[PDB]
Design an enzyme around this catalytic site. Structure first.
Site, PDB file in Angstrom:
ATOM      1  N   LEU A 114      -8.706   4.654   0.436  1.00 21.92           N
ATOM      2  CA  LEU A 114     -10.069   4.885   0.920  1.00 21.92           C
ATOM      3  C   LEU A 114     -11.002   5.434  -0.143  1.00 21.92           C
ATOM      4  O   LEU A 114     -10.849   6.567  -0.595  1.00 21.92           O
ATOM      5  CB  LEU A 114     -10.072   5.862   2.097  1.00 21.92           C
ATOM      6  CG  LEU A 114     -10.573   5.381   3.466  1.00 21.92           C
ATOM      7  CD1 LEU A 114     -10.687   6.594   4.367  1.00 21.92           C
ATOM      8  CD2 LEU A 114     -11.919   4.672   3.350  1.00 21.92           C
ATOM      9  N   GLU A 139      -3.364  -9.480 -11.204  1.00 22.63           N
ATOM     10  CA  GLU A 139      -3.888  -8.450 -10.277  1.00 22.63           C
ATOM     11  C   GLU A 139      -3.286  -8.615  -8.891  1.00 22.63           C
ATOM     12  O   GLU A 139      -3.136  -7.648  -8.156  1.00 22.63           O
ATOM     13  CB  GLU A 139      -5.411  -8.556 -10.086  1.00 22.63           C
ATOM     14  CG  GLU A 139      -6.234  -8.624 -11.342  1.00 22.63           C
ATOM     15  CD  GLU A 139      -7.665  -9.090 -11.081  1.00 22.63           C
ATOM     16  OE1 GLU A 139      -8.460  -8.320 -10.497  1.00 22.63           O
ATOM     17  OE2 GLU A 139      -7.991 -10.233 -11.457  1.00 22.63           O
ATOM     18  N   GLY A 194     -14.314   5.206   0.495  1.00 23.26           N
ATOM     19  CA  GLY A 194     -15.502   5.563   1.248  1.00 23.26           C
ATOM     20  C   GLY A 194     -16.490   4.412   1.229  1.00 23.26           C
ATOM     21  O   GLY A 194     -17.463   4.404   1.983  1.00 23.26           O
ATOM     22  N   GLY A 195     -16.231   3.443   0.351  1.00 29.00           N
ATOM     23  CA  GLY A 195     -17.081   2.274   0.234  1.00 29.00           C
ATOM     24  C   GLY A 195     -16.882   1.341   1.414  1.00 29.00           C
ATOM     25  O   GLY A 195     -15.889   1.446   2.138  1.00 29.00           O
ATOM     26  N   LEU A 196     -17.824   0.419   1.595  1.00 29.08           N
ATOM     27  CA  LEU A 196     -17.801  -0.536   2.698  1.00 29.08           C
ATOM     28  C   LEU A 196     -16.527  -1.365   2.830  1.00 29.08           C
ATOM     29  O   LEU A 196     -16.010  -1.550   3.936  1.00 29.08           O
ATOM     30  CB  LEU A 196     -19.017  -1.465   2.589  1.00 29.08           C
ATOM     31  CG  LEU A 196     -19.399  -2.471   3.691  1.00 29.08           C
ATOM     32  CD1 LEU A 196     -18.763  -3.807   3.411  1.00 29.08           C
ATOM     33  CD2 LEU A 196     -19.021  -1.945   5.059  1.00 29.08           C
ATOM     34  N   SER A 200     -13.054  -8.217  -1.725  1.00 31.48           N
ATOM     35  CA  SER A 200     -14.247  -8.366  -0.906  1.00 31.48           C
ATOM     36  C   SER A 200     -15.518  -8.598  -1.731  1.00 31.48           C
ATOM     37  O   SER A 200     -16.343  -9.441  -1.383  1.00 31.48           O
ATOM     38  CB  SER A 200     -14.433  -7.139  -0.010  1.00 31.48           C
ATOM     39  OG  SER A 200     -15.664  -7.237   0.687  1.00 31.48           O
ATOM     40  N   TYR A 247      -9.590  -4.956  -1.517  1.00 30.98           N
ATOM     41  CA  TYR A 247      -9.617  -5.702  -2.760  1.00 30.98           C
ATOM     42  C   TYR A 247     -10.107  -7.149  -2.580  1.00 30.98           C
ATOM     43  O   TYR A 247      -9.724  -7.839  -1.633  1.00 30.98           O
ATOM     44  CB  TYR A 247      -8.217  -5.671  -3.372  1.00 30.98           C
ATOM     45  CG  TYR A 247      -8.169  -5.906  -4.869  1.00 30.98           C
ATOM     46  CD1 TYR A 247      -8.319  -7.185  -5.398  1.00 30.98           C
ATOM     47  CD2 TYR A 247      -7.931  -4.853  -5.751  1.00 30.98           C
ATOM     48  CE1 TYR A 247      -8.225  -7.416  -6.772  1.00 30.98           C
ATOM     49  CE2 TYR A 247      -7.836  -5.069  -7.125  1.00 30.98           C
ATOM     50  CZ  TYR A 247      -7.980  -6.353  -7.624  1.00 30.98           C
ATOM     51  OH  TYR A 247      -7.852  -6.575  -8.969  1.00 30.98           O
ATOM     52  N   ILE A 277      -8.957   8.742  -4.665  1.00 28.64           N
ATOM     53  CA  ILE A 277      -8.777   9.220  -6.033  1.00 28.64           C
ATOM     54  C   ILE A 277     -10.100   9.314  -6.786  1.00 28.64           C
ATOM     55  O   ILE A 277     -11.003   8.505  -6.574  1.00 28.64           O
ATOM     56  CB  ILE A 277      -7.832   8.300  -6.844  1.00 28.64           C
ATOM     57  CG1 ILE A 277      -8.425   6.892  -6.944  1.00 28.64           C
ATOM     58  CG2 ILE A 277      -6.459   8.252  -6.194  1.00 28.64           C
ATOM     59  CD1 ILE A 277      -8.428   6.121  -5.647  1.00 28.64           C
TER      60      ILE A 277
END
EC number: 6.3.3.6
Lengths: 491, 473, 491, 491
Positions: free
Chosen positions: A244, A379, A246-248, A346, A344, A269
């Site tokens: 998390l 990735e 906190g981003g969309l 998005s 990841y 983090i």
């Protein structure tokens, strides 16, 4: 998860050499060996032309079974190998491109010549390497463990780190071939026994014409495609970890996850008092999740970088730098969860890497390029999370969602001084996240240790490629990386 | 009135005779001419190897779109032709067998020949007739109207009315071949311009091993596949008609339908005997459907039979007999509904035709035989309902439900002196239907007679006379 | 004789009823049972995907070996089946269209499926009959002996004798299908066991543009292609029979044969209406062959016709009429020779049916139509000759010669008040035949017995189809055809 | 010369840069350019889907026309391109492996996608190189001429000179891919426009089972295959050159040639260490041919080696050393002949490289290894001879002869203290050459110039790979190259 390899006419010695450094088991094939690490998964089933093997795991079995069930009632109980075998024999090799997962499918024919299908997104990068013997593997270090330090021939760093954009078949190993993801390959041998790979793509370029799909149908599609991956995991997991920020993107995944799983573990983090803990904490409280933070040191940031390189065999500077955050989370969640979901990708689908209010002649083209880039970097490899006892999943990275966004009208991605408009609209429609969050320093630290600018990814790639080679040649241990060894690689 | 036909190397003139008996429009093709009846639907799109045509309609668009959407976003805004084309080019012809509907797909290649894919269930049977010219059609009478009363050559009734089971390519028309359902065909021409059909099945026989699938998952699947057909029709229909027999089959459909449609119109027909108006009215009362019953006369019963023979070109006595009730419902529903759902097929999938308590060496084999039989009868043709302004649909007859039941363990179909056990269990678990409802060769000779009479243009659907039928021995 | 049949998914007991009327040996298959008549030929070999069979013989092994030899040395000592299997696996099914002969090639696939390739000219007509079981045979009468008198259903004569030109897949047997010559066929069965034939042609129509080929090259090609057939037969036959009429075609063949065989037997027929014994004797004298002439009566003409119908299963009036001469020649040569060469077809290629002084808009198109017509008649069937102990061969009917003349410039076929011009030039260049011959009434007898005109071939076909039916239903005997039966057939 | 290249989306700049060093002309394709040197040959023709191009020439048109003539009359007047098009469409890509010649066949599709078929012997080695743009060429130096000295990335000499046996797809150029000879290749571009080659071999490994073919037929086949090539050239050449070494191989070719061509020019060369002028003069006298001698100097000897390197792009020490003699002969024959025949290859098919009287567990496997080796070395390239105005030909190197000898019973190649037994028998039966020739030191001079032992071929390869690189980078020019510049490479 765990890696695997196949060696043509391999010997027990090749296998024992690998097991001295990698736990796992060997299995004999018609004319060679198959090795799979301790935490690797695989299934098999007898076919008409030979034995079919499915290494790794499938992410959309529900979808795949729904497909084969159209003609075969036995699909409902078929193992991973049997399931793809049904699609193969009925709809051909092209149908396997429809499966999602860190998998590799191959048919072991009597003549020793095998037919392989590589997953189409890069969740399981496969290489064919020519050493003393021919190897097919999704972990180059397995070949080194078997044949020695000199098995892999690396290209000059000047010729490697000179370009940031490469074909999805690019590899810095001169004596190797990167098998194109989403393709059928037959591993033949000519009259003198020399390896000859016959490849053919299972897909064709999709239309680039703008997709003027109405709003309602679009929202219904985003909802179904984002939840499908979760509905597949829910049945076999009670707890799930989520990075998390906190981003969309991460907040949306948490909001959806809270509706499929009972226990939610969120991790955040930061670095140098430069973080997003404020928003991240607001989401955790808003959904009542088992939250916990951690401020990474410049040392831990670099550790996440070298770990992504070792485990996912990443040689790209940008990709290794981005993976750092995920690897530090794996470490925090280790032993706390067995499944993790991220936001990841998005930004690559809905326009998050675009600049708000800015104009673009072809934003979809710019985005598509980045979606393709991920195919060769590593990735999306799952080895790192697997070694932490975690089954890593990226809900946004499904074929259906990726294809939907490929040519989706840009006004949905960048409009009225905003980005990811349609995603944000879908986000608050869930009535789970606060408007504040919905809205509708790793790159620095990395550059610091190297003594270069934050934007100089050529010098960052030269370093990452350095540790890459050292790790793959076995001269560097993921367990023993002294600060002196690191400094040597830097200058 | 949703039929079509194509004449190889033909012109619009060869279509003229057809338009004197049937209303519809003609369209030019690379090499040949196509005709489509007044109420027939069709879409097109330009492929790399020519123009693709899709005649008829698709029942599982939502499923097909979800499939093509995996790799192409353009699937969401594609017509039926472009949609099947995407599947064709990316997954091959075999992919078109996954589509459900009374359709026929073909590509008009500029190289002269055309590639044809026939639907896999029998919803839209296609014949290739060899008369003065070569014709591909889903209605044999169209050829007669084009070339004359003697265009079609029929087999001796003695040889046609003999067996009760036939291959799905069987046809009583000697100078014609029935294109196998679920197959890709290439209509080419040799060095002397003689027609040659190159066919290939798009499917292979499924396993016959007993499917020991657990109860819960099994019920979940049934609920899914039975409701999917309705979810696809719900968005485009306010009212829907249903032929209520009072039995479990038609009753279940009505129960589910009431959860997808706002207005439900149930119809119950029958004779002084064997009728079941009480049970129907009960279900209708429970679901609060707009219920209507009517007792048919012997003339009406026979009329329903001959009408099915004419409209869906059925030469089989048993099939035409069963269709009687349905066709009588169409008449009673005409102008009131545009979409109708039935319980047709349920008995063949869940063992409804089996006898309770009886012992069978292999019940699934008997059931599969009947499932296959419906492929050639023509009972699943949609012409009849269409001429009545109705889009006929049979929820039970979906690929997934059929395949699931194909080798489903017999105990789910016939257990301890009971039949359709698993179905009954799924039904009452809905809490919508009354427990009492859920329970918890001479004819073929006649049918074939009228069949020939209608296809050759002697008898007319609007001129049918009681004495004309009697004259037929 | 030399016919064969296979009962798809049948048993050895299904053949017993056939062996009751026809002598032959059985052969158990994986997907059925095979039957080969006593004088029939067949080879086999195990393929990497099933057992291959070759029923019949090949006329151009030398050419096929020369081709296969390009990549496989084992082609030089391979039996007929192995030889085609090499071409099949290397160049696909389409390569088998290059082979000449009255053969049929099929693969007995373990997965219960038959893959068959039919010869491309009609030397061995194959049919798939649907009785109580599915049958594939090159002789319809075998199915009758197997299932009985009502095994085959025939079409109304009016609907069979109305047209003269038909498709090469036409058959008067309603419950049967005629496999197209030169095509690959897969015999499978659906979920309920019903048989289904999936066919694909092995060739596409050739160019119709005039072929302006120079003199010398043309003559070298004709010389090569007309001699190859004889060179293939020379090694296995010391004596050869030849139907000598005294015309250019049969005279040319006789002249070429004298240069390949040490003993030549010539046979000439005629009727009480006309004959060319004068010219025929001339050629025999010039080449010193063993000659003999036979004057036929109306009865012998009819016998030849009915025999061509029984053995070759010919139902066409014109075809039967033409065959009458050959069948009578067989009866005369029987026991005297084991091989025979004819000038049959020569007229369809070089323009022999064309008349000097006549005006034709498209001569090659008229000829090509006749060339194609022979594909379904049965004129090229070898059963008839086989039963007389004779290996019948038609030198002119080779793939290369037919293709060469297909669009050969009309000036070579009809010019300066003469036809077969180039053919005449080639024959003349041999310096064997007297210029007299090089450059310049069964039909009536047949019509006489039927009581009609010699131009009415519709009434003649009605007679032939009548006997055709009676023979195939087992209601008539080829050994005994009483006059009372012959009369009812006529009317 | 006769080289060519194709550049996807190339520009007039690329073409003009090339013409700065190599004369020729460019031709626009659908989405790129075609470049063909001044004396290069090529033909084309429209196909149902795309324009077909044939670059180079065909050696066995008679055979190819004879095959296509089976179904098409237009085969006889078809140009090289139209001829392969006929085979391609009717028999598939696998059929173009039957063609012999220094050619490359490719279909230019509207969408830019190229379908290429490479000859199966190495007569025209084709590379696909990834520089600024993607190139498909049979001459690597053309790419350097177009994009500059740094276009080609060369592998470390230590890695390139460490072995003398490689796969036929081996190339010392890192940013390049050597297209397998005898395969079909689709040059596609994926969703992001990146080159992706899809390759498929057209051949399959022949049987290694001993071929115990009887002697008489064996001699007949050898005779047919060694003369076929001569029958193709005879019609278009009055004078032919022959490199006569007095050895059985070259002597036999001279003996056969004398029966096909009017005039024969025999050329012989020898070093100051030794020669074979004695035996060669005997054949010239015996057959009465225009003979010529020439004693090569240490300089001319080395000049022959570096020329083979430049013109044929050979990097292999051994192969370059062998070509020396041939190139010196091209020089001596320049302007005197337009066609040349050699006995090159004979030793590899008939056992000439084996030791007389020695024992070999598997002589055929050793020979087969050498036959394959020639596929990648460049020994069969025709550029060298082309720049000397000579159409070089190697009679022994035909698919049929090569395939025949592939597994031919060893007792035919090595028996009772002799080698090439069956070849000597065939030669002697001609009664054209003296018994001492039929029998019923360049390698040293090279080792001296370098200063190493004749045994040490790694030092020779070092030098050859060094000259190879210098020439391909454009550093050295074949126009003004001198020994002084070559000495700088030696050390």
């Amino acid at each position: 998860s765990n890696s695997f390899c196949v060696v043509y006419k391999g010997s027990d010695t090749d296998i024992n050499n690998i097991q001295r450094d990698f736990d796992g088991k060997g299995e004999a094939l018609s004319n060679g060996y198959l090795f799979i690490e301790q935490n690797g998964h695989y299934q098999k089933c007898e076919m008409e032309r030979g034995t079919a093997y499915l290494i790794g795991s499938l992410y959309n079995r529900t979808f795949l079974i729904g497909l084969a069930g159209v003609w075969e009632g036995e699909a409902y109980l078929a193992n991973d190998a049997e399931l793809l075998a049904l699609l193969f024999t009925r709809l051909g090799a092209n149908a396997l491109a429809l499966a999602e997962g860190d998998f590799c499918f191959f048919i072991d024919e009597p003549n020793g010549e095998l037919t392989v299908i590589t997953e189409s997104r890069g969740f399981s990068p496969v290489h064919v390497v020519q050493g003393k013997k021919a190897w097919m593997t999704n972990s180059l270090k397995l070949v080194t463990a078997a044949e020695g330090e000199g098995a892999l021939w690396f290209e000059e760093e000047a010729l490697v780190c000179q370009s940031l954009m490469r074909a999805d078949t690019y590899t810095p190993v001169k004596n190797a071939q990167r098998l194109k993801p989403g393709a059928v390959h037959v591993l033949t041998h000519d009259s003198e026994g020399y390896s000859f790979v016959e490849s053919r793509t299972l897909t064709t370029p999709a239309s680039n014409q703008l997709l003027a799909l109405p709003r309602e149908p679009l929202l219904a599609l985003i909802d179904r495609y984002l939840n499908a991956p979760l509905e597949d995991l829910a049945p076999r997991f009670d707890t799930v970890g989520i990075p998390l920020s906190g981003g969309l993107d991460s907040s949306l995944v948490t909001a959806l996850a809270s509706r499929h799983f009972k226990k939610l573990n969120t991790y955040s983090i930061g670095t140098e008092l430069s973080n997003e803990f404020e928003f991240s904490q607001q989401v955790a409280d808003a959904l009542g999740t088992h939250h916990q933070m951690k401020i990474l040191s410049e040392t831990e940031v670099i550790n996440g970088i070298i770990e992504s390189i070792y485990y996912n065999e990443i040689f790209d500077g940008l990709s290794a730098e981005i993976q750092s955050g995920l690897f530090n989370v794996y470490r925090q969640a280790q032993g706390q969860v067995s499944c993790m979901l991220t936001g990841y990708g998005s930004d690559l689908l809905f326009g998050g890497i675009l600049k708000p209010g800015a104009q673009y002649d072809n934003p979809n083209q710019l985005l598509a390029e980045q979606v393709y880039r991920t195919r060769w970097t590593g990735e999306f490899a799952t080895h790192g999370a697997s070694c932490y006892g975690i089954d890593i999943r990226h809900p946004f990275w499904s074929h259906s969602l990726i294809s939907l966004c490929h040519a989706l009208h840009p006004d949905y991605k960048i409009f009225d001084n905003e980005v990811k408009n349609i995603l944000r609209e879908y986000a608050d429609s869930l009535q789970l996240l606060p408007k504040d969050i919905v809205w509708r320093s790793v790159n620095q630290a990395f550059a610091n240790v190297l003594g270069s600018t934050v934007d100089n990814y050529q010098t960052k790639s030269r370093f990452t490629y350095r540790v890459y080679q050292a790790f793959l040649r076995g001269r560097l241990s993921i367990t023993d990386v002294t600060p002196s060894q690191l400094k040597d690689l830097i200058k």
